[PDB]
Nucleic acid binder design. Structure first.
Ligand SMILES: [Mn+2]
Ligand SMILES: [Mn+2]
Ligand SMILES: [Mn+2]
Length: 430
DNA sequence: ATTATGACGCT
DNA sequence: AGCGTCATG
């Protein structure tokens, strides 16, 4: 009882931009705004592959990983924006720069961990303590939470979405103990006030809408963020976890959407996250390993300790291109030309990174795939990265992979290469 | 013939 | 170090 640490020490938010690449394109081209539209890379094969979908287009069943020609079958008036192509390959610079815009606004409120191009975690514990000592027991008006959902409410003893949102929020605010500066539910509520302000600032200063989740840790904040998209935020309290998890498929939790989650389901004979509570920590550790087992044991009770890392910048900068089927690289000149294209984009991004962020990469990683290998990477080799020069890094990459060519002929390349990847890593301050 | 990344765990 | 897993704009 008095010693069961309930993992309610922190206030953590996850902010995720709605249909990010689509919003970037809609800001640039007002003709795309408030329309079914999607962002595609390339065009010749099946109209290009969709990587981002506006909510209007999602209503027609358009999804990521769909070919545009097929999406057009579902949504004949779908509008498409194409990713820029530079040096023969997709170039995602516009979206990376847009991401930096959003990350810089978020960093004004608290330290953030960049989790992806369009999302960051926020540790709001200290900002909440500050805002609470500023409020001085004053209760929290529903007017401060105009886009917040309280997960699990309304409950107990109107038929429109906004009406139910407001009913649930009213139930939450009425149950609140606004005099206790250490109540976790109050702390989450103030956290949600701050996140409303953060999201207002992002939209005001960039044009971009986002959603957010507010809870006591990263996994719950991410899950909460997904519950009411687009353009809304969701508070998942510690108390909401049992009901939320009682019907929550195991795969919906970050880290469990793959092989490990499938093995939880098959080994334990369960479907939902809440069913995990019936196993001891040792049982879970026996099946899934010591770390995963401790993590599952705590996570199914709403508890997770992974910190919000103070890291706004990516740890690696990389360039990759697939060469499927008939496009696979089968000559030395081909392989060298594409290594040079990738290296030229890498050099440009690295030089910008050095100027902006006062750091230099020191390791170059070269990864390839060979035709007929089921794995995404067939080979991975590192070498020193001592100079930001594309000709040098492409020669070095070729030097470290050239021994994969089983062709006795030095001109041909066999088996042909279906992917090239260059990645700069191990940054140092300079 | 979803493609282009980026993080992190394992050994 | 190099490999595998997970995430997905
Ligand atoms: Mn998003
Ligand atoms: Mn995201
Ligand atoms: Mn998505």
């Amino acid at each position: 009882g008095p010693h069961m640490a309930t993992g309610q020490d922190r206030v953590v938010a996850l902010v995720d931009m709605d249909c990010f690449f689509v919003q970037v394109e809609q800001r640039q081209n007002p003709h795309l705004r408030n329309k079914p539209c999607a962002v595609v890379q390339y065009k010749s094969w099946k109209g290009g592959g969709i990587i981002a979908v506006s909510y209007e287009a999602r209503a027609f069943g358009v999804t990521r990983s769909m070919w545009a020609d097929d999406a057009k079958k579902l949504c004949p008036d779908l509008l498409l924006a194409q990713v820029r192509e530079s040096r023969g390959k997709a170039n995602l610079t516009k979206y990376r720069e847009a991401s930096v815009e959003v990350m810089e606004i978020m960093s004004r409120f608290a330290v953030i961990e960049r989790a992806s191009i369009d999302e960051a975690y926020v540790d709001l514990t200290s900002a909440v303590q500050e805002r609470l000592q500023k409020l001085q027991g004053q209760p929290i008006s529903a007017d401060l939470l105009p886009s917040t959902y309280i997960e699990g409410l309304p409950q107990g003893p109107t038929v429109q979405k906004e009406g139910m949102r407001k009913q649930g929020l009213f139930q939450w605010l009425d149950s609140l103990q606004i005099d206790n500066l250490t109540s976790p539910d109050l702390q989450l509520t103030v956290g949600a006030v701050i996140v409303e302000e953060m999201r207002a600032a992002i939209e005001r200063e960039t044009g971009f809408q986002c959603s957010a989740g507010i809870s006591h840790n990263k996994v719950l904040a991410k899950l909460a963020c997904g519950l009411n998209k687009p353009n809304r935020q969701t508070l998942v309290s510690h108390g909401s976890v049992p009901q939320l998890f009682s019907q929550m498929p195991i795969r919906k939790i970050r880290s469990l959407g793959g092989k490990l989650g499938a093995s939880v389901i098959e080994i334990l004979g369960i479907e939902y996250m809440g069913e995990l509570t019936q196993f001891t920590e040792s049982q879970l550790q026996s099946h899934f390993g010591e770390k995963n087992g401790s993590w599952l044991y705590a996570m199914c009770r709403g508890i997770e300790h992974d910190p919000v890392k103070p890291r706004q910048l990516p740890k690696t900068i990389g360039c990759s291109k697939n060469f499927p089927g008939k496009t696979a690289l089968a000559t030395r000149e081909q392989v060298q030309w594409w290594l040079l294209q990738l290296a030229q984009e890498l050099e440009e991004r690295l030089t910008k990174d050095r100027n902006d962020n006062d750091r230099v990469a020191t390791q170059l990683v070269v990864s390839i795939r060979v035709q007929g290998d089921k794995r995404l990477s067939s080979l991975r080799r590192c070498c020193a990265l001592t100079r930001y020069d594309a000709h040098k890094m492409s020669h070095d990459a070729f030097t470290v992979i050239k021994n994969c060519n089983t062709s006795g002929i030095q001109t041909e390349w066999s088996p042909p290469l279906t992917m090239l990847f260059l990645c700069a890593t191990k940054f140092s301050a300079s």
